[PDB]
């Protein structure tokens, strides 16, 4: 522990929208301080979203107005893409860090294989 | 899905042994891949991995140098050289896949698939 939980795959309705479910159980004295989530391009993860001490920020206009990733639960960070693209098929990763009780940080990641079916 | 290891049997100090693990049910290439050992009474730990899409390779301190991962994408089968056999290396080996991609290689929960394990002496 901790660990994500993160489906093996999702498949999304083209022009739809689409939850990559992202979850975990907070731990007693470990503060989350950075979530990222990634698009796979060959053997190089992209960070296309990452959540900081200064809030969300979209690394790229193709996102902007359609990504938002979940804020409302502890432990959901889920991401909901909307209005999905043909392109949007790729392998993406959840990534979580946590300062931990004994004064260092953690991180965890997984990975979904997100499937857009006309 | 199966998780099939082979290699290991009987060996004394010095030696040399190769490990390897066969992966049947997806493309484990998306997966990320790891070698983990359990002595007898001497809780499971980690040996070494090899993450998804190509990727890198990581290892505990005790047996780095010594060991090496490796992975055929197209066999679906991961690898661990093993040079310099230590006796206290004298477990059972188990080969592991998870979903995780650069982080959290070494805890045994990021993993979901097992397999039997390999006993080396």
């Known amino acids: 522990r901790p660990i994500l939980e993160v489906p093996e795959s999702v498949t999304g309705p083209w022009k739809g929208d689409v939850n990559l479910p992202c979850t975990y159980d907070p731990l007693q004295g470990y503060t989350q301080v950075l979530v990222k989530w990634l698009v796979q391009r060959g053997s190089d993860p992209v960070t296309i979203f990452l959540r900081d001490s200064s809030g969300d920020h979209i690394q790229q206009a193709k996102y902007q107005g359609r990504l938002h990733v979940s804020h409302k639960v502890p432990g959901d960070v889920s991401l909901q893409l909307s209005t999905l693209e043909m392109d949007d098929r790729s392998h993406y990763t959840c990534e979580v860090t946590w300062q931990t009780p004994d004064g260092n940080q953690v991180v965890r990641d997984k990975i979904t294989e997100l499937r857009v079916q006309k | 899905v199966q998780l099939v290891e082979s290699g290991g049997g009987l060996v004394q100090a010095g030696g040399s042994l190769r490990l390897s693990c066969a992966a049947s049910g997806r493309t484990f290439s998306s997966y990320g891949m790891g070698w983990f050992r359990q002595a007898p009474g001497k809780e499971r730990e980690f040996v070494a991995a090899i993450g998804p899409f190509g990727g890198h390779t990581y290892y505990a301190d005790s047996v780095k140098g010594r060991f090496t991962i490796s992975r055929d994408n197209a066999k679906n089968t991961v690898y661990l050289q093993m040079n310099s056999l230590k006796p206290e290396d004298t477990a059972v080996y188990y080969c592991?896949?998870?979903?995780?991609?650069?982080?959290?290689?070494?805890?045994?929960?990021?993993?979901?698939?097992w397999g039997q394990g390999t006993q080396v002496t």
């Open positions: 592991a896949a998870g979903r995780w991609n650069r982080y959290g290689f070494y805890d045994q929960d990021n993993y979901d698939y």
